[PDB]
Amino acid sequence: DLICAQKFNGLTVLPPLLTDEMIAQYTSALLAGTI
């Protein structure tokens, strides 16, 4: 995979601090607050 060869030369892709499930709580909260 593209990430694998990258992962193999010293190219690492750190994880986004906020997982998508977390973002989906914010964009739920803002969206649930606005309503």
Partner: protein, 49 residues
């Protein structure tokens, strides 16, 4: 309801995002290919020199 129909068949409206993801993997690719280039040296493999 119109929004969900648009997205259902629209690849382009996300072009802004899709471009950003592309351009990174692009320069990421190109960064990798540069490991195969001679740069004037007799080979692009470190040990084989």
């Amino acid at each position: 309801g119109k929004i969900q129909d648009s997205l259902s068949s629209t690849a382009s409206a996300l072009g802004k995002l899709q471009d950003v993801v592309n351009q990174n993997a692009q320069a990421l690719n190109t960064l990798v290919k540069q490991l195969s280039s001679n740069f004037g040296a007799i080979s692009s493999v470190l040990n084989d020199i």
